[PDB]
Amino acid sequence: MAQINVIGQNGGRTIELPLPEVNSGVLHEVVTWQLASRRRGTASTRTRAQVSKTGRKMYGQKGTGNARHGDRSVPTFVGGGVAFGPKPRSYDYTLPRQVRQLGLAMAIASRQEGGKLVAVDGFDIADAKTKNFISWAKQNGLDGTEKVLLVTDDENTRRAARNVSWVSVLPVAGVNVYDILRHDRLVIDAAALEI
Amino acid sequence: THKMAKRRIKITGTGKVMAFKSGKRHQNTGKSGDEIRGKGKGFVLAKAEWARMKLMLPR
């Protein structure tokens, strides 16, 4: 709604800001899902005698003077199989798109209520060299005391990236609620496709 | 279920369950009273809680 770019105003920024200020509830629903979906389901557990190794029968039921149990592969046995252990699950599902759209809107708007940066003509990087990135950021008020999320096209401008800290490259709007919210501030650079 | 399909236990608009009438049906009728032609549609919802999940795609 209010932003001045690197090449000078792009015709102005308006877009929209889903008032009241963002929402934490709807936000956290998204990131929860986000991390949940990206979660890799994996588990090691041995069930019982099919999955463990034992076989057969044991000392026989009545009249041994000791306890009843007929096998060694059972949960109640040390070295045995396991009951109700974890199996290779999924943890994935489709968050309604309406919310996924609404999520980063809110999140972009979360950077707007605070410090927000958009850019055109960031050519000062001078190929890559990674150093002029440090300068370009420094001239733009980016200390390095904040963690920044750079999102853009023009891979050269991205090819300078990944500083000692704080610099994270996110190519051509693969932008998600998580990454932009976890960072201190965000630079969406190119306003194109941010139309 | 497949049991109540061509059978009784019809659901309605309100979701209530429709029962037919049994005695007597195709045999052992004889006697006198109207009552033969008086076995129609009927219902109770007391048992019907357990009849919904038995066949609900249709009414």
């Binding site: 919210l181 | 009784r8 049994s22 038995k54």
Partner: protein, 134 residues
Amino acid sequence: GSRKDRKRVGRGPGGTDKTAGRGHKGQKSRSGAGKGAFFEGGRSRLIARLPKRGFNNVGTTYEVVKLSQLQDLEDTTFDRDTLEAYRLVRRKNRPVKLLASGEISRAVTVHVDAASAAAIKAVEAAGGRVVLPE
């Protein structure tokens, strides 16, 4: 701030841990355990006791178009043959029938597979027509 991100305030509770003093030792007391038989049970179930033969069939069934939808509200814009989108028929692949519900005097032209004669009464009596395929 990611760490500042809050709950939903009563989106949902945790499950039930049945291992403890205070709330455990559960299921029934006797014969409620190790289960998996259940559903409905007895001597001779009501179901079997109850008569029917009847039928199945279910041949042609029609998409209903409520008449109040056309007339009055919107423009009474002459929905024509396929309005589809912005109109209420969706799944289709089934014939469509037009039935009288709401009414006003405004002209209409409706192409449907059939319609009620008491609806088709009010279609012309407001001006306009309903046509059917050959």
